[PDB]
Amino acid sequence: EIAMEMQLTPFLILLRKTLEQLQEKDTGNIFSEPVPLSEVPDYLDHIKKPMDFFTMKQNLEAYRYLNFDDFEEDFNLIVSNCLKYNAKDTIFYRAAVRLREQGGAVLRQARRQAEK
Ligand SMILES: CCN(C(=O)c1ccccc1OC)c1cc2c(cc1N1CCNC[C@H]1C)n(C)c(=O)n2C
Numbered sequence: 001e002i003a004m005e006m007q008l009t010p011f012l013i014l015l016r017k018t019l020e021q022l023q024e025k026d027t028g029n030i031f032s033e034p035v036p037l038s039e040v041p042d043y044l045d046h047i048k049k050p051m052d053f054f055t056m057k058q059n060l061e062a063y064r065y066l067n068f069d070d071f072e073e074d075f076n077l078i079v080s081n082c083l084k085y086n087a088k089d090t091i092f093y094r095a096a097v098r099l100r101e102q103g104g105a106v107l108r109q110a111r112r113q114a115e116k
Contacts, residue, residue, distance in 0.1 A: 001116030015060055018110040023053040025102040030095050031078050046085050051077035068114045072107055
């Protein structure tokens with residue numbers, strides 16, 4: 001399977017499935033819409049690039065993820081943003097740790113498929 005020959009549609013089908021699997025791990029509904037700046041007024045004082053699963057879905061369908069690195073980078077922002085903004089004694093921090101853990105095998109297996 002050679003990179004210049006790779007078709008977009010199959011790759012996007014793979015990313016759609018992978019994103020569904022990742023988002024399903026958000027059983028607390030913490031990561032599935034943007035952190036609202038109106039309700040968390042200091043959020044952008046700390047976080048340079050917010051990310052969430054709905055924004056990832058929009059990016060996917062707008063053809064913004066054309067390799068696995070860029071996709072995984074945004075999933076990793078969901079986690080890292082949360083670990084920075086929230087203290088390690090909070091439920092939200094631990095929820096990000098759990099999301100990273102559960103996302104791990106999903107992403108590794110998905111990348112292996114993307115590399116054929
Ligand atoms: C701003 C929403 N939020 C809350 O914790 C919250 C605040 C006020 C009133 C109700 C609320 O939720 C019930 C929130 C903050 C987050 C946050 C997520 C949320 N909410 C929790 C409720 N579901 C939506 C989600 C965006 N993440 C990932 C963060 O890093 N921070 C700081």
